[PDB]
Amino acid sequence: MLSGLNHLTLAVSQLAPSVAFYQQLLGMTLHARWDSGAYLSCGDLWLCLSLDPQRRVTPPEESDYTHYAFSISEADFASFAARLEAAGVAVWKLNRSEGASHYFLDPDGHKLELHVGSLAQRLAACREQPYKGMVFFE
Amino acid sequence: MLSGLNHLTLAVSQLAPSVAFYQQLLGMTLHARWDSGAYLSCGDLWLCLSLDPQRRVTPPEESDYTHYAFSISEADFASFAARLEAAGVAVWKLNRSEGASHYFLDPDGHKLELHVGSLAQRLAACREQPYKGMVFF
Numbered sequence: 162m163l164s165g166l167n168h169l170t171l172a173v174s175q176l177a178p179s180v181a182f183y184q185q186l187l188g189m190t191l192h193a194r195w196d197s198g199a200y201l202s203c204g205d206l207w208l209c210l211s212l213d214p215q216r217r218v219t220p221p222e223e224s225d226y227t228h229y230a231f232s233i234s235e236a237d238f239a240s241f242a243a244r245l246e247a248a249g250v251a252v253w254k255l256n257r258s259e260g261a262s263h264y265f266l267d268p269d270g271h272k273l274e275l276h277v278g279s280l281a282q283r284l285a286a287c288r289e290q291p292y293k294g295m296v297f298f299e
Numbered sequence: 300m301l302s303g304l305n306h307l308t309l310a311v312s313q314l315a316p317s318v319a320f321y322q323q324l325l326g327m328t329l330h331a332r333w334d335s336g337a338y339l340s341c342g343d344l345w346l347c348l349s350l351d352p353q354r355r356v357t358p359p360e361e362s363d364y365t366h367y368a369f370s371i372s373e374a375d376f377a378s379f380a381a382r383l384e385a386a387g388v389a390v391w392k393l394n395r396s397e398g399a400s401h402y403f404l405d406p407d408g409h410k411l412e413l414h415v416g417s418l419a420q421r422l423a424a425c426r427e428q429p430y431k432g433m434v435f436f
């Protein structure tokens with residue numbers, strides 16, 4: 162039986178710039194670093210950066226919708242997003258679904274998101290306004 | 300400040316086979332499905348499948364090391380991995396780091412992992428034998 166996400170590993174092209182992004186701009190806790198990677202945490206999330214020569218800096222129009230969303234409070238959301246924009250962090254999508262979201266890119270083009278709201282909130286909102294063809298399971 | 304992972308979203312090329320993979324082979328809870336996606340949960344993890352025409356079925360030698368690992372108990376690991384093998388789910392590497400891991404591919408080539416062990420456990424093991432050039436904070 163699976164009990165949750167154990168860790169998220171991101172391939173990065175340059176270790177020090179990527180560590181600075183996740184530690185300083187996103188406020189994650191840096192636990193350890195070595196010449197091929199780094200270990201960070203964000204609440205319960207175990208984040209791994211892996212230095213990978215196969216990684217290319219990918220513009221958002223050349224990658225699919227796969228993306229990673231981090232939780233933030235309603236009160237912190239707007240100034241956090243504004244600080245990222247002032248830091249030159251690129252936006253890859255305008256928010257369109259329920260709950261505050263800021264869609265931004267990491268230094269290698271990994272697609273990230275800040276989101277306010279849980280799965281329960283999304284399901285309740287979708288029951289009120291169902292997506293095309295949407296069905297629910299008890 | 301950020302408080303954790305809110306959700307993981309995977310682009311998929313065929314919605315029904317991917318739902319069957321995550322719901323039936325991995326045992327995740329299917330909450331909702333629509334013409335272009337699905338919502339599942341795995342413990343506290345909110346997983347979204349997004350039907351994407353752009354999604355390529357990507358061989359593991361043409362993608363980088365980005366991958367997603369799910370937690371499983373030590374008692375459950377061996378038989379869960381064996382069921383994936385019997386279902387023909389591909390393995391993309393052998394375990395070379397501390398703590399039981401099974402490295403497998405989803406139908407579109409997303410790199411997945413079953414793993415027993417926490418961050419605290421990995422940090423404990425690294426303090427006994429650090430990786431190359433390792434610095435501790």
Ligand SMILES: C[C@@H]1O[C@@H]1P(=O)(O)O
Binds near residue numbers: 262274306
């Ligand atoms: C919540 C799932 O990722 C989708 P959204 O970000 O389009 O809402």
Ligand SMILES: C[C@@H]1O[C@@H]1P(=O)(O)O
Binds near residue numbers: 170209397400412
């Ligand atoms: C835990 C970080 O992904 C690396 P590993 O799976 O190679 O140990």
Ligand SMILES: [K+]
Binds near residue numbers: 258
């Ligand atoms: K949203």
Ligand SMILES: [K+]
Binds near residue numbers: 394398400
């Ligand atoms: K391992």
Ligand SMILES: [Mn+2]
Binds near residue numbers: 228230306
């Ligand atoms: Mn999202």
Ligand SMILES: [Mn+2]
Binds near residue numbers: 366
């Ligand atoms: Mn891993």
